[PDB]
Write a protein that binds this DNA or RNA. Structure first.
Ligand SMILES: [Mg+2]
Ligand SMILES: [Mg+2]
Ligand SMILES: [Mg+2]
Ligand SMILES: [Mg+2]
Ligand SMILES: [Mg+2]
Ligand SMILES: [Mg+2]
Ligand SMILES: [Mg+2]
Ligand SMILES: [Mg+2]
Ligand SMILES: [Mg+2]
Lengths: 102, 79, 81, 109, 174
RNA sequence: CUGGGCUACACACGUGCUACAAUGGAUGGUACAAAGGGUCGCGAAGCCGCGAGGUGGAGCCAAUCCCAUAAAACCAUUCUCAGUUCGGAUUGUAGGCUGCAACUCGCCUACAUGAAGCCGGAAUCGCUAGUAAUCGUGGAUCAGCAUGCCACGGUGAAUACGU
């Protein structure tokens, strides 16, 4: 159960954009089998030269997930920000388990 | 009147402590008292709170309160 | 005025209804002063009170004496969620 | 006893406050005009003492008569159209306190 | 005991020269008083029923008879024969004395004493009162009270219509 | 320029204040500070009111007078483990004060009403000595309004093997 919070500046947070952000970051639940309910901080901003930025923070208890991206349009950045986040969950989880198993 | 299956119902004399209003009507409760009235009615002197001689609907209670006038109070309070 | 020196009544509102006693609820009164306590002289009259963007009419009763005009002219428009 | 049952093991200064419309400070006067000591158990006062208290407490307002008066005032505001009426009729905080947060003691759970 | 005496010595002439009755026995009187209680909540716990039974036996003077259900309504989780309620019937001296106690000392105990209902008549001369607090009757005590529960005192009169029952009750003191 | 709004409210999050009582509540007596402000300003004695407050005008352009009685602590009585003599929200009535004006939308007082709450899940924060903890005091903004901010003092711990 994830609770979102989008800080739309220099842009309008339309419902289609809200649905796109919610459904793409919602697939992270498969990895981290108990995601304690936490608040997601999402920021969007667009420049004058048609560049889009997304910043995500998901403060899981021992897992501080972040990723920030800059690309052409808004949708490419959101699709490319999952890869940076999924790496950190896979990095943090498999670091704990295999090391205590020498 | 079947015997042995009824609670005791000895007579009793009522007294109203509010205004000293004597009254006679037998009651089941013994109340552990003794007093004789009206040429001999020796029984418990059961005390009680206000009877029908002082209640609002059961007696002639006049006001026990006051009223309001509002606009009168506004005229009185303001001057 | 919530003190002994009161009550507080707006001049131009008080004078207008005072000369409207001949009308006897024959003219609507269009006023802005919401900070005037309702007087006994106001009873039976209908006044239009500015609620921030328009005038809303209220018929003065006896129960309304001692209150302010604005109490019967809600400002915020709430209709649930 | 004195309008309604009052506690027995308690004290008269404390026991009286168990009836609607009376409080700790007002219990000082009704125990002063009655001329009876404050530190007296309820199951110790005689009829003469209890009689004066009931006579003294009669002048002051009590439950029922006070319970209906306050509700009558609340009703008067509901249909007159005053602002406090909509607060009373909708359960939102009546006086001058906010509503964005912390209005649960009147709105409920 | 006395209330019957005043009834048959002063109220009787008043009804006589107020209603212009032909003969003597046409004047109405009080036939019986029947008191009822409901323990429909005692479907599971059968002991609160018993507690109410000794309550009624104490308060009247005669033990009540436990009433059994006449149906098996599933809405009230009922089966036929389940003991529900109790009743005490007063006829004669006990009736008059109990009514006197009720009118002179029991009624001046209700929390909001404004007057008994003036429209509680079944339409044929019988009055049903609906007191719903336990120790309205002074006999029982607050400590002994285990569950606040109401009662149904019913007065059955020989009058043929409501109004003369109304005047008879007012003459008695209701 | 007047009026309204920035004070909305099914709800979610962050930061604080008050509690869930006996090392405590209530009643009576009494001791001990530092740092600051005061001239269209501080405002004492006296008198009145249960109270918030009112009249009054002393002295002070201040190591001089006022703000200004410090509170926890100490000493006696009572309450006797309860949703209570704990807790105070909420609300009805009656008042005070500033301001031309207190309804939206101020602060305080008197009476009465008496709610959740009996130590808080997963998780998480601060602190190494006059520190944490706890109790009072003052100042800026200010006609009025701080549980916020910036400063002052009173009482006063536990623990640190170690990386
Ligand atoms: Mg993808
Ligand atoms: Mg406010
Ligand atoms: Mg703001
Ligand atoms: Mg207390
Ligand atoms: Mg106000
Ligand atoms: Mg109080
Ligand atoms: Mg509870
Ligand atoms: Mg406890
Ligand atoms: Mg200030």
């Amino acid at each position: 159960m994830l609770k979102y919070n989008i800080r739309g500046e220099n842009i309008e947070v339309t419902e289609p954009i809200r649905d796109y952000v919610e459904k793409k970051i919602d697939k992270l639940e498969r990895y981290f089998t108990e995601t304690p309910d936490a608040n997601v901080h999402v920021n969007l901003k667009v420049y004058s030269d048609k560049n889009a930025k997304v910043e995500v923070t998901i403060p899981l208890p021992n897992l501080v997930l972040r990723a920030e991206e800059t690309s052409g349009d808004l949708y490419a950045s959101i699709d490319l920000i999952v890869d940076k986040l999924e790496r950190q969950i896979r990095k943090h989880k498999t670091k704990v388990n295999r090391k205590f198993r020498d | 009147m079947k015997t042995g299956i009824h609670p005791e119902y000895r007579p009793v004399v009522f007294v109203d402590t509010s205004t000293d209003f004597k009254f006679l009507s037998g009651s089941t409760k013994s109340s552990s008292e003794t007093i004789k009235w009206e040429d001999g009615n020796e029984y418990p002197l059961l005390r009680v709170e206000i009877s029908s001689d002082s209640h609002p609907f059961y007696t002639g209670k006049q006001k026990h309160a006051t009223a309001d006038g509002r606009v009168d109070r506004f005229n009185k309070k303001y001057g | 005025r919530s003190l002994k020196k009161g009550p507080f009544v707006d001049d131009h509102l008080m004078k207008k209804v005072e000369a409207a006693a001949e009308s006897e609820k024959k003219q609507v009164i269009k006023t802005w002063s919401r900070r005037s306590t309702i007087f006994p002289t106001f009873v039976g009259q209908t006044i239009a009170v500015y609620d921030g963007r328009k005038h809303v009419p209220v018929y003065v009763q006896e129960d309304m004496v001692g209150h302010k005009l604005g109490e019967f002219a809600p400002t915020r428009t709430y209709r649930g969620h | 006893i004195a309008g309604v049952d009052v506690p027995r093991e308690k004290r008269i200064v404390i026991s009286l406050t168990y009836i609607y419309g009376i409080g700790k400070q007002t219990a000082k006067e009704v125990l002063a005009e009655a001329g009876v000591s404050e530190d007296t158990r309820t199951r110790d006062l005689t009829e003469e003492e209890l009689g004066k208290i009931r006579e003294i407490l009669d002048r002051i307002k009590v439950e029922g008569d006070l319970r209906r008066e306050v509700n009558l005032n609340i009703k008067r505001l509901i249909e007159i159209g005053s602002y406090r009426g909509m607060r009373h009729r909708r359960g939102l905080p009546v006086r001058g306190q906010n509503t964005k947060n912390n209005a649960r003691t009147r709105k409920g759970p | 005991n006395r209330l019957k005496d005043q009834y048959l010595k002063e109220i009787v002439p008043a009804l006589m020269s107020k209603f212009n009755y032909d003969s003597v026995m046409e004047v109405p009187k009080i036939d019986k008083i029947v008191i009822n209680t409901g323990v429909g909540d005692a479907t599971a716990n059968a002991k609160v029923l018993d507690s109410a039974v000794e309550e009624l036996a104490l308060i009247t003077g005669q033990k009540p008879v436990i009433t059994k259900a006449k149906n098996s309504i599933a809405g009230f989780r009922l089966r036929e024969g389940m003991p529900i309620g109790a009743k005490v019937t007063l006829r004669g001296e006990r009736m008059y004395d109990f009514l006197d106690k009720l009118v002179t000392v029991s009624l001046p105990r209700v929390r909001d004493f404004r007057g008994v209902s003036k429209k509680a008549f079944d339409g044929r001369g019988n009055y049903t009162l609906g007191v719903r607090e336990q120790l309205i009757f002074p006999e029982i005590d607050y400590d002994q009270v285990s569950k606040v529960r109401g009662m149904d005192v019913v007065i059955v009169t020989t009058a043929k219509s409501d109004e003369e029952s109304h005047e008879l009750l007012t003459q008695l003191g209701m």
